[PDB]
From Swiss-Prot:
The lineage of its organism: Bacteria, Pseudomonadati, Pseudomonadota, Gammaproteobacteria, Enterobacterales. SUPFAM superfamilies: Periplasmic binding protein-like II (SSF53850). NCBIfam families: PRK09474.1 (NF007011). Keywords: Periplasm, Signal, Sugar transport, Transport. It comes from Escherichia coli O157:H7. Its main location: periplasm. This is Maltose/maltodextrin-binding periplasmic protein. Part of the ABC transporter complex MalEFGK involved in maltose/maltodextrin import. Binds maltose and higher maltodextrins. One of its GO terms (molecular function) is maltose binding. GO terms for biological process: maltodextrin transmembrane transport; maltose transport.
Length: 513
């Protein structure tokens, strides 16, 4: 492969303690004579799947657990199998965070949650509510200070407020149940936008700007995670870490992340990586080395957390964590975060109204599951000649899109039968490994669009054609992964177009009779 044998390359995000991680690398190198190299590439969570998909990249990838399901689904991660004894050294719920389809796909490192960080000298008694921050800002502005600055370019930081009065991603209690554009999410975002309209915050504020303003004592509060504490320590600001403000009497609910370490599927150094992570990093001295660089939060290792738990900053971190929720690791978490990122930025800048912004994010977030429901049902009923008698769920969009697809797809399949026959024969889709090869082909072709619903119908119709063939040669098991592959290709390459058409509602209206 392209990844070098007998070395370790490790990627971790630039806001984490990568210099501390390098020391742990240095110790490994001392013992074994094996080179360890730590990098913190920009846009890491985007860069890794790009390079790993070609069998390249780092041996070890660090990120919060939410992205790892997508990585694993794309075949980019090796299954990890720690022995029972190592497993028992970490909290079971941190292992739960890195389980995907019944398999462990990463080592959990530390539990991260946002807290309210405040300047004790400016604000001895920080607000318990979001609602009182406008008035507090006015009071502080008279002194040449502002109340609150935090990163508005990443939805992670705004999510706690969105979730406060009822917003949610995928319902936890149902991936078909998405609460990005309900009244609670709209109330939360609207409050944020009003703060901006009323000059209490600035839409342009990002991570660097907010951090600088807090650490220079210009703003009384910021919202951030444990990794940020080291820089505040250096600035000598007298800070406290506390519970996030409530909104409409309800706690802010941060999405909780577990910093995790995955092993590249393409790495020839999986045994080396295992050794490094289990017996160097995930020890008291290993985690201390990283934690002393940038604080990890509440670590997964039971022994070392027993000490860190005494830190009131950690207690505050876990208080906020318990009021929030552990992130899902389903493959469309990335699409969810992109949708909401755009919604927050657009609402904050005035490019969209809050309502229209969150509507788009709802559609974006639901896009994979909605598309899969339609495409899977269509391919299956086409292959077997009979519909699925199971209930749709939410909602009328699926039923109407499927009705439309059946009606339009009938003519498309009749007219394209000869073409489909030739393409099926040209390719050789005979099993599930052939389905993967088709995806790579489709990704290349479908970026040359030029998108309309007719082309999408032709693609799905070819899918149905192939599905029929797979049933005929007794490979009915291949139909669902075919549907997933086409769905993945479609929603990935035509995401923006699909959201612009209002998703499958646009499909139904376009072909309305
Ligand atoms: C018909 C030829 C066959 N072919 C030739 C060049 C060739 O080189 O063989 C393709 O490369 C080709 C390859 C894979 C998919 C498809 N397309 S297809 O699935 O609809 C199809 C499959 C089999 C057929 F017989 C006819 C259409 C391919 O089409 C192309 C035409 N083409 C450029 C296109 O269909 N583009 C497109 C479709 C959907 C979407 C989207 F994303 F909006 F859905 C975007 C772009
Ligand atoms: O803003 C969306 C973003 O949120 C989370 O990323 C966090 C990460 O978990 C933290 O470790 C820290 O680095 O801040 C990040 C936000 O800038 C999700 O983990 C990530 O997938 C998502 O894109
Ligand atoms: Mg819209």
């Amino acid at each position: 492969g392209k990844i070098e044998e007998g070395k370790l390359v490790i990627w971790i995000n630039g806001d984490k303690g990568y210099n501390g991680l390098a020391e742990v690398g240095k110790k490994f190198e001392k013992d074994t004579g094996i080179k360890v190299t730590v990098e913190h590439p920009d846009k890491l969570e985007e860069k890794f799947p790009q390079v790993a998909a070609t069998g390249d990249g780092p041996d070890i990838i660090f990120w919060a657990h939410d992205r790892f399901g997508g990585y694993a689904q794309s075949g980019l991660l090796a299954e990890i199998t720690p022995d029972k004894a190592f497993q028992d050294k970490l909290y079971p719920f941190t292992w739960d965070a890195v389980r995907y389809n019944g398999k462990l796909i990463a080592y959990p490192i530390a539990v991260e949650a946002l807290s309210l960080i405040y300047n004790k000298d400016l604000l001895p008694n920080p607000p318990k509510t979001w609602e009182e921050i406008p008035a507090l800002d006015k009071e502080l502005k008279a002194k040449g200070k502002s109340a609150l600055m935090f990163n508005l370019q990443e939805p992670y930081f705004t999510w706690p407020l969105i979730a406060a009065d009822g917003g949610y991603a995928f319902k936890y209690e149902d991936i078909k149940d998405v609460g990005v554009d309900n009244a609670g999410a709209k109330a939360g975002l609207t409050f944020l936008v009003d703060l901006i309209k009323n000059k209490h915050m600035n839409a342009d504020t990002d991570y660097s700007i907010a951090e600088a303003a807090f650490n220079k004592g210009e703003t009384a509060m910021t919202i951030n995670g444990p990794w940020a504490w080291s820089n505040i320590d250096t600035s000598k600001v007298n800070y406290g870490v506390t519970v996030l403000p409530t909104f409409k009497g309800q706690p802010s609910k941060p999405f909780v992340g577990v910093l995790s370490a995955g092993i590249n599927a393409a790495s020839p150094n999986k045994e080396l990586a295992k050794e490094f992570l289990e017996n160097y990093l995930l020890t008291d001295e290993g985690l201390e080395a990283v934690n002393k660089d940038k604080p990890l939060g509440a670590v997964a290792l039971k022994s070392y957390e027993e000490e860190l738990a005494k830190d009131p900053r950690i207690a505050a971190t876990m208080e906020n964590a318990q009021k929030g929720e552990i992130m899902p690791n389903i493959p469309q978490m990335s699409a969810f975060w992109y949708a909401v990122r755009t919604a927050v930025i657009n609402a904050a800048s005035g490019r969209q109204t809050v309502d229209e912004a969150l509507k788009d994010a709802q559609t974006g977030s639901e896009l994979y599951r909605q598309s899969l429901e339609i495409i899977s049902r269509y391919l299956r009923e086409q292959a077997t000649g009979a519909a699925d008698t199971a209930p749709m769920g939410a909602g009328a969009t699926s039923r109407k899109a499927l009705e439309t697809l059946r009606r339009v797809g009938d003519g498309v399949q009749r007219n394209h039968e000869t073409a489909f026959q030739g393409m099926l024969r040209k390719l050789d889709i005979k099993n599930e490994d052939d389905v993967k090869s088709l995806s790579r082909v489709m990704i290349h072709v479908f970026s040359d669009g030029v998108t309309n619903w007719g082309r999408i119908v032709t693609l799905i119709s070819f899918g149905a054609f192939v599905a029929k063939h797979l049933k005929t040669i007794n490979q009915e098991s291949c139909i669902e992964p075919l549907a997933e592959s086409i769905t993945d290709v479609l929603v990935r390459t035509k995401r923006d177009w699909l959201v612009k058409q209002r998703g499958w509602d646009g499909f139904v209206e376009f072909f309305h009779v």
